[PDB]
Amino acid sequence: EAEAKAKALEAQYRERERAETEALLARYRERAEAEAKAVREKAMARLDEAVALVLKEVLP
Amino acid sequence: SKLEAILSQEVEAEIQALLQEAEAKAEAVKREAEEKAKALLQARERALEAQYRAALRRAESA
Protein backbone atom coordinates (compact mmCIF):
# COMPACT_ATOMS: atom_id res chain seq x y z
CA GLU A 1 0.00 0.00 0.00
CA ALA A 2 3.06 2.26 0.05
CA GLU A 3 3.18 1.46 -3.63
CA ALA A 4 -0.47 2.61 -3.52
CA LYS A 5 0.54 6.01 -2.05
CA ALA A 6 2.97 6.45 -4.91
CA LYS A 7 0.29 5.54 -7.48
CA ALA A 8 -1.99 8.12 -5.97
CA LEU A 9 0.82 10.66 -6.30
CA GLU A 10 0.85 10.09 -10.05
CA ALA A 11 -2.86 10.82 -10.46
CA GLN A 12 -2.89 14.44 -9.48
CA TYR A 13 0.50 14.95 -10.96
CA ARG A 14 -0.74 13.81 -14.37
CA GLU A 15 -4.19 15.30 -14.18
CA ARG A 16 -3.56 18.85 -13.07
CA GLU A 17 -0.57 19.03 -15.36
CA ARG A 18 -2.61 18.07 -18.37
CA ALA A 19 -5.33 20.51 -17.54
CA GLU A 20 -3.05 23.47 -16.99
CA THR A 21 -1.01 23.02 -20.10
CA GLU A 22 -4.19 22.33 -22.01
CA ALA A 23 -5.48 25.69 -20.95
CA LEU A 24 -2.19 27.50 -21.26
CA LEU A 25 -1.75 27.59 -25.00
CA ALA A 26 -5.31 28.54 -25.67
CA ARG A 27 -5.20 31.56 -23.44
CA TYR A 28 -1.90 32.80 -24.73
CA ARG A 29 -2.80 32.19 -28.29
CA GLU A 30 -5.94 34.16 -27.88
CA ARG A 31 -3.96 37.12 -26.61
CA ALA A 32 -1.83 36.74 -29.62
CA GLU A 33 -5.01 36.69 -31.68
CA ALA A 34 -6.03 39.94 -30.13
CA GLU A 35 -2.75 41.69 -30.49
CA ALA A 36 -2.48 40.59 -34.08
CA LYS A 37 -5.58 42.35 -35.10
CA ALA A 38 -4.56 45.50 -33.32
CA VAL A 39 -1.29 45.78 -35.20
CA ARG A 40 -3.05 45.40 -38.54
CA GLU A 41 -5.18 48.27 -37.50
CA LYS A 42 -2.05 50.35 -36.68
CA ALA A 43 -0.73 49.40 -40.11
CA MET A 44 -3.81 50.65 -42.02
CA ALA A 45 -2.82 54.21 -41.10
CA ARG A 46 0.78 53.98 -42.18
CA LEU A 47 -0.23 52.09 -45.31
CA ASP A 48 -0.79 54.86 -47.82
CA GLU A 49 2.27 57.01 -47.17
CA ALA A 50 4.73 54.09 -47.43
CA VAL A 51 3.50 53.34 -50.93
CA ALA A 52 3.51 57.04 -51.90
CA LEU A 53 7.04 57.29 -50.66
CA VAL A 54 8.09 54.09 -52.31
CA LEU A 55 6.54 55.06 -55.59
CA LYS A 56 8.51 58.26 -55.93
CA GLU A 57 11.89 56.72 -55.33
CA VAL A 58 12.07 54.14 -58.09
CA LEU A 59 10.89 56.29 -61.00
CA PRO A 60 14.00 57.83 -62.73
CA SER B 1 9.95 -28.85 46.80
CA LYS B 2 11.94 -25.64 46.86
CA LEU B 3 14.49 -26.91 44.33
CA GLU B 4 11.96 -27.91 41.67
CA ALA B 5 9.92 -24.76 42.28
CA ILE B 6 13.03 -22.84 41.45
CA LEU B 7 13.79 -25.03 38.43
CA SER B 8 10.32 -24.31 37.11
CA GLN B 9 10.54 -20.57 37.75
CA GLU B 10 13.93 -20.31 36.10
CA VAL B 11 13.07 -22.18 32.94
CA GLU B 12 9.99 -20.08 33.00
CA ALA B 13 12.22 -16.93 33.35
CA GLU B 14 14.19 -18.28 30.43
CA ILE B 15 10.94 -18.41 28.46
CA GLN B 16 10.37 -14.79 29.39
CA ALA B 17 13.61 -13.75 27.78
CA LEU B 18 12.97 -15.73 24.56
CA LEU B 19 9.66 -14.03 24.10
CA GLN B 20 11.09 -10.63 24.83
CA GLU B 21 13.80 -11.07 22.18
CA ALA B 22 11.35 -12.40 19.60
CA GLU B 23 9.10 -9.44 20.21
CA ALA B 24 12.02 -7.09 19.64
CA LYS B 25 12.92 -8.89 16.38
CA ALA B 26 9.36 -8.29 15.29
CA GLU B 27 9.39 -4.65 16.35
CA ALA B 28 12.60 -3.87 14.47
CA VAL B 29 11.03 -5.35 11.34
CA LYS B 30 7.84 -3.37 11.96
CA ARG B 31 9.83 -0.19 12.23
CA GLU B 32 12.00 -0.96 9.21
CA ALA B 33 9.00 -1.24 6.97
CA GLU B 34 7.63 2.01 8.22
CA GLU B 35 10.82 3.89 7.29
CA LYS B 36 11.20 2.09 4.01
CA ALA B 37 7.72 3.13 2.92
CA LYS B 38 8.19 6.74 4.03
CA ALA B 39 11.33 6.95 1.99
CA LEU B 40 9.72 5.65 -1.14
CA LEU B 41 6.87 8.07 -1.21
CA GLN B 42 9.47 10.76 -0.70
CA ALA B 43 11.34 9.72 -3.80
CA ARG B 44 8.28 9.87 -5.94
CA GLU B 45 6.94 13.08 -4.45
CA ARG B 46 10.14 14.86 -5.33
CA ALA B 47 10.38 13.67 -8.84
CA LEU B 48 6.77 14.24 -9.76
CA GLU B 49 6.79 17.68 -8.37
CA ALA B 50 9.73 18.55 -10.50
CA GLN B 51 8.22 16.96 -13.61
CA TYR B 52 5.28 19.20 -13.28
CA ARG B 53 6.95 22.45 -12.76
CA ALA B 54 9.20 21.90 -15.74
CA ALA B 55 6.43 20.49 -17.92
CA LEU B 56 4.31 23.54 -17.53
CA ARG B 57 7.39 25.51 -18.27
CA ARG B 58 7.35 23.91 -21.67
CA ALA B 59 3.72 24.94 -21.90
CA GLU B 60 4.80 28.56 -21.37
CA SER B 61 7.56 28.20 -23.87
CA ALA B 62 5.01 27.29 -26.52
Enter the resolution in angstroms: 6.7
Q: What homologous superfamily is domain B1-62 in, according to CATH?
A: F1F0 ATP synthase subunit B, membrane domain (1.20.5.620)
**Experimental method of this PDB entry:** cryo-EM
Residue of B nearest to A11 (CA): B48
CA pair distance B28, B32, nearest whole angstrom: 6
Q: Is B46 exposed, middle or buried (0-12, 13-18, 19+ CB in 10 A)?
A: exposed
**What residues of A are in contact with residue B57 (Cβ under 8 Å)?**
none
Annotation-wise, does A57 bind a ligand? yes
CA distance B21 to B16: 9
Count other C-beta atoms under 10 Å from residue B60's C-beta. Answer: 10
Residues from chain B that touch A20, judged by Cβ atoms under 8 A, are: 56, 59
- Could you tell me if residue A41 is left (phi over 0), alpha (psi between -120 and 50 degrees) or otherwise beta? alpha
Residue ranges covered by each domain of chain B: 1-62
